[PDB]
Amino acid sequence: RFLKVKNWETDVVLTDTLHLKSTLETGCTEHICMGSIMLPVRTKDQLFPLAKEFLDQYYSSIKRFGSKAHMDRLEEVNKEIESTSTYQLKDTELIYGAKHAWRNASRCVGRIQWSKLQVFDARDCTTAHGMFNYICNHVKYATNKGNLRSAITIFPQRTDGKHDFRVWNSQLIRYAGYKQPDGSTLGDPANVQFTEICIQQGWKAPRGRFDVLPLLLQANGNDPELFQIPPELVLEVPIRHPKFDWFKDLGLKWYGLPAVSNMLLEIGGLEFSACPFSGWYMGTEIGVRDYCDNSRYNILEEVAKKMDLDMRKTSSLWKDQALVEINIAVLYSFQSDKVTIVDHHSATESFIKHMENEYRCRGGCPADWVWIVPPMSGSITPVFHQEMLNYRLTPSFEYQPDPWNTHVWKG
Amino acid sequence: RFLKVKNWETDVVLTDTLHLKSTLETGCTEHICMGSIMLPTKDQLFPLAKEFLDQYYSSIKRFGSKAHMDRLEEVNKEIESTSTYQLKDTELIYGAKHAWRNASRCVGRIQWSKLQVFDARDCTTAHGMFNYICNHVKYATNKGNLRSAITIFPQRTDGKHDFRVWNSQLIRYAGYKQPDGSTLGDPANVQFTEICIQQGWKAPRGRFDVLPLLLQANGNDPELFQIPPELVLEVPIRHPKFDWFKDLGLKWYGLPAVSNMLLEIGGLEFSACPFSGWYMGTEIGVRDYCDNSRYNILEEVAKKMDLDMRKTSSLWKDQALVEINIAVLYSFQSDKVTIVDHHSATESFIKHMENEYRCRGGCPADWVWIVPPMSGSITPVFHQEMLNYRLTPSFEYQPDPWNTHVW
Ligand code: HEM
Ligand code: HEM
Ligand SMILES: CNCCN(C)c1cccc(CCc2cc(C)cc(N)n2)c1
Ligand SMILES: CNCCN(C)c1cccc(CCc2cc(C)cc(N)n2)c1
Ligand SMILES: C[C@H](O)[C@H](O)[C@H]1CNc2nc(N)[nH]c(=O)c2N1
Ligand SMILES: C[C@H](O)[C@H](O)[C@H]1CNc2nc(N)[nH]c(=O)c2N1
Ligand SMILES: [Zn+2]
């Protein structure tokens, strides 16, 4: 079966054959679309086909499909599953797997860079302290004094689901949020629950507007431990505006390194519950969502006040006007300190080319339009006008429940 | 089977039960989501009439009444005899308001119940059609105080006798392909603009020439008519701070009036059902003016603002986009023509969603279309999970007549 997508700006039509290789569900049916819904211990039984599938993919990519090296590996894995109920990936397989999980990530606009991913194998790690070490090294390597490099660190895979490695932080670097008795919030409202946990686990909170959270690390199913990332390894960028001198006085800054640490990495049916990954920011992530979401820092009014916009009627577009200047400020700041960042025009245009190249060479590119289109200026980016097919391929990054909700406390 | 939707900005969760009444298909499967794709007999007829009459009679709190049962047999008799049936005025009106109510892609649906319905099923000719349409335009325009309306022409019979309005909207600017290779006027209408000329229209070959109506009655050949200019309300576009802005020579019409869709009610098909409301500002300023394949004026506005257009990262496109949209709202409000900004309209839609969930068990909605094409996440609909499904009565797409019509 062939499926066609059309770009309604360029009339370019592409044909997808890759969806045929799609396994997992979407959440949609013939009678209902769930494309705007945010969130849509394995047996030896189901494990081997999943291993076989992966290994088949792997050996095809290296052009050794049906070789003795291929067959022997299948046999080898088959036996290891029957006698041990699981198996270990070769380094080459782990690297291929991690890159392809990124490549298959349909909500990610930045996938043109997928083949350039630095894979840190942390499968020999045994303790929280060991995790801290790996993570520090990840952060130093990725930051690279401002010239950012994509990386992922992979901790040991799930066994019986009782010895999980987990990073409790949603991101490696993130600002604390504090609920005040008056109901207002100090810092990042999105991190209030996590900050409270850290505090309870013994973290002495400085209680400012931008306190870098501590790492809360769980190894081998044990209770999580607190570590503070060395400040010298956390690159931050004070935000200022190229024309507005008062902007610096808002007191804003942000960190340079976006690093997601709460996702699950599935490769060949194996589950890696601790796999922090990092790249670089698209400007709007900070300047639109982080600064301007009503439930985040929420700086639109204060910025608009200073620009002296007509804030009486929404139809003055004072919110839209302030949003653009804030986003201009974020980009100007990062560029000025030579910390890697990409604007949403540049990023979306690159994704279009990547997507086109993925149709030619791969037969498709699964993409989630709802997430790909930037949260400001949507239709002046080429992705707005691009029809996309969303379906799920493995290897993949998956969601997983927050550890504080599932963890068995030891004491 | 009882689905929930969350607003991630307010934590409000709503439970959807209405989707269970859905009958038509979405185009998605368990394996692939097509949510971003633009375009996915007597025995057929009677269940459709039934489903429709059941909901109609339920809406008037007379489910399982003699009148209900009586009407059901009456329509059954008529289908079994005529191979079709006629809607009572009351059903027709209910039908139309519900097609709008059910339009999952429409952000302006909070007003759905105040639709003025013009019954034009007695129409037999294109001059006839023209007369109905002029009346519609005048009534809906209301000297700038816009009122929603629909005019309904006779239902399809054998597909040989279709009424069609060939225009996509009642009022649209013409578009011409100059020998330069460039495009003068609206590029979206180049092909239809040729068909007008091919059928006899004399273009003023300008930039904002109001297209002529091309009307088809009983499957006959379509005819041209020029709407009385005095009935087409337009808004010169100026900026409340940029005095130079008016020299760009931009204007826009006040009445958005979609004329090419198909209205399906109780199995019956109305291929000519022009309807109209009032603009949300971004349709004009973001899409019409700044789409690359439309008037595409970003670069020239940017020049006039003397913005640093060297790098994409100065966000000069974004900056101009805001100003252009500021101007659109300003000009319409200044001339007292109804318009709504994307903040007000999306906040209204959220309130409507809440009303629909609490009073109907849900509200079908297409996030891809509801989220305005600028400043998406600073409007509340961005953070609102929505379920998309197909309810009837409905507005559907239908093929362009020129590809179909047998002369
Ligand atoms: C290098 C530059 C990168 C850019 C500019 C980028 C951009 C983005 C953006 C803007 C999102 C939307 C998330 C949000 O708005 O909350 C996203 C999602 C995502 N990204 Fe990327 N990313 C980059 C690197 C990476 C890397 C290195 C990985 C994995 C190895 C990755 C995997 C993902 C995944 C799995 C999602 C899905 C999130 C979800 O499902 O909720 N990205 N990306
Ligand atoms: C009164 C103020 C109204 C507003 C502000 C409004 C707004 C909108 C907008 C912005 C869209 C997106 C379409 C696009 O971007 O091209 C839309 C779609 C739509 N509207 Fe409304 N509308 C209004 C009245 C009406 C009325 C009176 C009807 C029918 C009687 C209607 C039926 C529809 C339908 C069927 C669609 C989707 C068409 C499709 O499937 O592509 N609207 N509306
Ligand atoms: C509900 N929010 C999603 C949080 N998650 C799971 C998530 C996943 C991937 C990406 C993001 C946005 C942060 C980010 C991460 C990376 C590696 C790059 C980038 N530009 N942004 C967030
Ligand atoms: C891209 N979609 C095709 C154009 N169609 C079929 C379509 C249908 C309904 C609405 C629109 C947008 C124009 C419009 C119409 C009405 C009544 C109100 C309004 N504010 N805008 C367009
Ligand atoms: C590819 C994508 O489906 C297409 O660009 C859609 C996106 N959302 C839209 N939303 C609205 N309101 N109007 C449109 O024309 C479109 N176009
Ligand atoms: C309800 C809706 O799906 C939700 O708000 C989505 C919309 N699109 C998004 N797009 C990005 N990049 N990030 C997001 O968190 C979201 N959130
Ligand atoms: Zn879908």
PDB file of N, CA, C and O in Angstrom, chain A residues 105-140:
ATOM      1  N   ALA A 105      11.834   9.303  16.032  1.00  0.00           N
ATOM      2  CA  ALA A 105      11.080  10.163  16.940  1.00  0.00           C
ATOM      3  C   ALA A 105      10.176  11.185  16.203  1.00  0.00           C
ATOM      4  O   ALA A 105      10.598  12.300  15.862  1.00  0.00           O
ATOM      5  N   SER A 106       8.914  10.831  16.002  1.00  0.00           N
ATOM      6  CA  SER A 106       8.067  11.607  15.085  1.00  0.00           C
ATOM      7  C   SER A 106       7.756  13.046  15.538  1.00  0.00           C
ATOM      8  O   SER A 106       7.416  13.884  14.707  1.00  0.00           O
ATOM      9  N   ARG A 107       7.876  13.327  16.837  1.00  0.00           N
ATOM     10  CA  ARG A 107       7.623  14.671  17.349  1.00  0.00           C
ATOM     11  C   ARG A 107       8.869  15.567  17.351  1.00  0.00           C
ATOM     12  O   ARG A 107       8.810  16.706  17.805  1.00  0.00           O
ATOM     13  N   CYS A 108       9.988  15.067  16.834  1.00  0.00           N
ATOM     14  CA  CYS A 108      11.249  15.817  16.895  1.00  0.00           C
ATOM     15  C   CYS A 108      11.600  16.563  15.603  1.00  0.00           C
ATOM     16  O   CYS A 108      11.867  15.940  14.574  1.00  0.00           O
ATOM     17  N   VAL A 109      11.604  17.896  15.647  1.00  0.00           N
ATOM     18  CA  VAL A 109      11.877  18.675  14.440  1.00  0.00           C
ATOM     19  C   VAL A 109      13.360  18.633  14.052  1.00  0.00           C
ATOM     20  O   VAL A 109      13.720  18.940  12.905  1.00  0.00           O
ATOM     21  N   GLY A 110      14.214  18.226  14.992  1.00  0.00           N
ATOM     22  CA  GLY A 110      15.651  18.357  14.796  1.00  0.00           C
ATOM     23  C   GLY A 110      16.348  17.111  14.283  1.00  0.00           C
ATOM     24  O   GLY A 110      17.564  16.987  14.408  1.00  0.00           O
ATOM     25  N   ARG A 111      15.588  16.210  13.668  1.00  0.00           N
ATOM     26  CA  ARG A 111      16.109  14.891  13.301  1.00  0.00           C
ATOM     27  C   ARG A 111      17.100  14.860  12.136  1.00  0.00           C
ATOM     28  O   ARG A 111      17.637  13.803  11.815  1.00  0.00           O
ATOM     29  N   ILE A 112      17.357  15.996  11.498  1.00  0.00           N
ATOM     30  CA  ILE A 112      18.347  16.019  10.423  1.00  0.00           C
ATOM     31  C   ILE A 112      19.730  15.634  10.977  1.00  0.00           C
ATOM     32  O   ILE A 112      20.613  15.166  10.244  1.00  0.00           O
ATOM     33  N   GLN A 113      19.903  15.804  12.284  1.00  0.00           N
ATOM     34  CA  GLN A 113      21.188  15.548  12.931  1.00  0.00           C
ATOM     35  C   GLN A 113      21.330  14.126  13.491  1.00  0.00           C
ATOM     36  O   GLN A 113      22.357  13.793  14.098  1.00  0.00           O
ATOM     37  N   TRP A 114      20.311  13.293  13.267  1.00  0.00           N
ATOM     38  CA  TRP A 114      20.200  11.973  13.911  1.00  0.00           C
ATOM     39  C   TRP A 114      21.420  11.056  13.790  1.00  0.00           C
ATOM     40  O   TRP A 114      21.771  10.364  14.748  1.00  0.00           O
ATOM     41  N   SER A 115      22.056  11.036  12.624  1.00  0.00           N
ATOM     42  CA  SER A 115      23.226  10.182  12.441  1.00  0.00           C
ATOM     43  C   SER A 115      24.466  10.673  13.215  1.00  0.00           C
ATOM     44  O   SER A 115      25.426   9.919  13.368  1.00  0.00           O
ATOM     45  N   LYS A 116      24.448  11.920  13.696  1.00  0.00           N
ATOM     46  CA  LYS A 116      25.567  12.453  14.493  1.00  0.00           C
ATOM     47  C   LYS A 116      25.169  12.526  15.958  1.00  0.00           C
ATOM     48  O   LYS A 116      24.781  13.586  16.473  1.00  0.00           O
ATOM     49  N   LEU A 117      25.262  11.387  16.624  1.00  0.00           N
ATOM     50  CA  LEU A 117      24.843  11.260  18.004  1.00  0.00           C
ATOM     51  C   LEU A 117      25.965  10.516  18.709  1.00  0.00           C
ATOM     52  O   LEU A 117      26.373   9.437  18.263  1.00  0.00           O
ATOM     53  N   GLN A 118      26.480  11.098  19.789  1.00  0.00           N
ATOM     54  CA  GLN A 118      27.570  10.482  20.542  1.00  0.00           C
ATOM     55  C   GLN A 118      26.967   9.527  21.579  1.00  0.00           C
ATOM     56  O   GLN A 118      26.193   9.947  22.453  1.00  0.00           O
ATOM     57  N   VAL A 119      27.279   8.238  21.466  1.00  0.00           N
ATOM     58  CA  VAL A 119      26.655   7.248  22.341  1.00  0.00           C
ATOM     59  C   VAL A 119      27.575   6.871  23.497  1.00  0.00           C
ATOM     60  O   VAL A 119      28.637   6.275  23.294  1.00  0.00           O
ATOM     61  N   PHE A 120      27.165   7.213  24.713  1.00  0.00           N
ATOM     62  CA  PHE A 120      27.931   6.810  25.877  1.00  0.00           C
ATOM     63  C   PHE A 120      27.331   5.551  26.513  1.00  0.00           C
ATOM     64  O   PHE A 120      26.205   5.564  27.026  1.00  0.00           O
ATOM     65  N   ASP A 121      28.083   4.461  26.447  1.00  0.00           N
ATOM     66  CA  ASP A 121      27.627   3.168  26.949  1.00  0.00           C
ATOM     67  C   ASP A 121      27.841   3.101  28.454  1.00  0.00           C
ATOM     68  O   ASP A 121      28.959   2.893  28.901  1.00  0.00           O
ATOM     69  N   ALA A 122      26.786   3.253  29.247  1.00  0.00           N
ATOM     70  CA  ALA A 122      26.960   3.208  30.698  1.00  0.00           C
ATOM     71  C   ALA A 122      26.399   1.932  31.307  1.00  0.00           C
ATOM     72  O   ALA A 122      25.984   1.937  32.472  1.00  0.00           O
ATOM     73  N   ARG A 123      26.407   0.842  30.530  1.00  0.00           N
ATOM     74  CA  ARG A 123      25.809  -0.417  30.972  1.00  0.00           C
ATOM     75  C   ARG A 123      26.594  -1.148  32.051  1.00  0.00           C
ATOM     76  O   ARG A 123      26.085  -2.113  32.621  1.00  0.00           O
ATOM     77  N   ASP A 124      27.815  -0.696  32.345  1.00  0.00           N
ATOM     78  CA  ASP A 124      28.590  -1.287  33.447  1.00  0.00           C
ATOM     79  C   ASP A 124      28.387  -0.525  34.755  1.00  0.00           C
ATOM     80  O   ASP A 124      29.010  -0.836  35.768  1.00  0.00           O
ATOM     81  N   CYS A 125      27.513   0.481  34.736  1.00  0.00           N
ATOM     82  CA  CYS A 125      27.277   1.287  35.935  1.00  0.00           C
ATOM     83  C   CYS A 125      26.486   0.477  36.978  1.00  0.00           C
ATOM     84  O   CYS A 125      25.613  -0.334  36.621  1.00  0.00           O
ATOM     85  N   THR A 126      26.803   0.668  38.261  1.00  0.00           N
ATOM     86  CA  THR A 126      26.131  -0.103  39.303  1.00  0.00           C
ATOM     87  C   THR A 126      25.519   0.722  40.427  1.00  0.00           C
ATOM     88  O   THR A 126      24.687   0.220  41.185  1.00  0.00           O
ATOM     89  N   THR A 127      25.949   1.970  40.561  1.00  0.00           N
ATOM     90  CA  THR A 127      25.537   2.785  41.704  1.00  0.00           C
ATOM     91  C   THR A 127      25.167   4.199  41.291  1.00  0.00           C
ATOM     92  O   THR A 127      25.542   4.654  40.203  1.00  0.00           O
ATOM     93  N   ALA A 128      24.474   4.901  42.188  1.00  0.00           N
ATOM     94  CA  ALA A 128      24.056   6.283  41.960  1.00  0.00           C
ATOM     95  C   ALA A 128      25.255   7.184  41.703  1.00  0.00           C
ATOM     96  O   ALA A 128      25.222   8.057  40.822  1.00  0.00           O
ATOM     97  N   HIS A 129      26.303   6.980  42.499  1.00  0.00           N
ATOM     98  CA  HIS A 129      27.539   7.730  42.339  1.00  0.00           C
ATOM     99  C   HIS A 129      28.132   7.490  40.957  1.00  0.00           C
ATOM    100  O   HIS A 129      28.600   8.439  40.303  1.00  0.00           O
ATOM    101  N   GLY A 130      28.115   6.229  40.516  1.00  0.00           N
ATOM    102  CA  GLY A 130      28.535   5.896  39.164  1.00  0.00           C
ATOM    103  C   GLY A 130      27.706   6.649  38.126  1.00  0.00           C
ATOM    104  O   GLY A 130      28.225   7.066  37.082  1.00  0.00           O
ATOM    105  N   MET A 131      26.419   6.834  38.413  1.00  0.00           N
ATOM    106  CA  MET A 131      25.538   7.511  37.467  1.00  0.00           C
ATOM    107  C   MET A 131      25.920   8.984  37.420  1.00  0.00           C
ATOM    108  O   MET A 131      25.975   9.584  36.347  1.00  0.00           O
ATOM    109  N   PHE A 132      26.213   9.550  38.589  1.00  0.00           N
ATOM    110  CA  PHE A 132      26.592  10.953  38.685  1.00  0.00           C
ATOM    111  C   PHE A 132      27.825  11.216  37.822  1.00  0.00           C
ATOM    112  O   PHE A 132      27.865  12.177  37.043  1.00  0.00           O
ATOM    113  N   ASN A 133      28.816  10.339  37.943  1.00  0.00           N
ATOM    114  CA  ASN A 133      30.031  10.465  37.162  1.00  0.00           C
ATOM    115  C   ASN A 133      29.760  10.469  35.659  1.00  0.00           C
ATOM    116  O   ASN A 133      30.226  11.374  34.943  1.00  0.00           O
ATOM    117  N   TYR A 134      29.023   9.459  35.184  1.00  0.00           N
ATOM    118  CA  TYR A 134      28.668   9.371  33.764  1.00  0.00           C
ATOM    119  C   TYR A 134      27.949  10.633  33.291  1.00  0.00           C
ATOM    120  O   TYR A 134      28.256  11.179  32.225  1.00  0.00           O
ATOM    121  N   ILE A 135      27.009  11.102  34.103  1.00  0.00           N
ATOM    122  CA  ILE A 135      26.180  12.241  33.736  1.00  0.00           C
ATOM    123  C   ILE A 135      26.990  13.542  33.663  1.00  0.00           C
ATOM    124  O   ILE A 135      26.787  14.366  32.756  1.00  0.00           O
ATOM    125  N   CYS A 136      27.912  13.717  34.604  1.00  0.00           N
ATOM    126  CA  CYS A 136      28.814  14.865  34.581  1.00  0.00           C
ATOM    127  C   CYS A 136      29.613  14.868  33.292  1.00  0.00           C
ATOM    128  O   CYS A 136      29.685  15.892  32.605  1.00  0.00           O
ATOM    129  N   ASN A 137      30.202  13.718  32.965  1.00  0.00           N
ATOM    130  CA  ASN A 137      30.980  13.563  31.736  1.00  0.00           C
ATOM    131  C   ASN A 137      30.114  13.819  30.495  1.00  0.00           C
ATOM    132  O   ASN A 137      30.550  14.457  29.527  1.00  0.00           O
ATOM    133  N   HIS A 138      28.882  13.327  30.526  1.00  0.00           N
ATOM    134  CA  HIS A 138      27.948  13.607  29.442  1.00  0.00           C
ATOM    135  C   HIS A 138      27.808  15.131  29.264  1.00  0.00           C
ATOM    136  O   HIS A 138      28.010  15.648  28.160  1.00  0.00           O
ATOM    137  N   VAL A 139      27.466  15.828  30.351  1.00  0.00           N
ATOM    138  CA  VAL A 139      27.252  17.268  30.338  1.00  0.00           C
ATOM    139  C   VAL A 139      28.476  18.055  29.879  1.00  0.00           C
ATOM    140  O   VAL A 139      28.341  19.036  29.140  1.00  0.00           O
ATOM    141  N   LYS A 140      29.661  17.644  30.311  1.00  0.00           N
ATOM    142  CA  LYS A 140      30.867  18.365  29.911  1.00  0.00           C
ATOM    143  C   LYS A 140      31.058  18.150  28.410  1.00  0.00           C
ATOM    144  O   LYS A 140      31.188  19.119  27.644  1.00  0.00           O
TER     145      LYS A 140
END
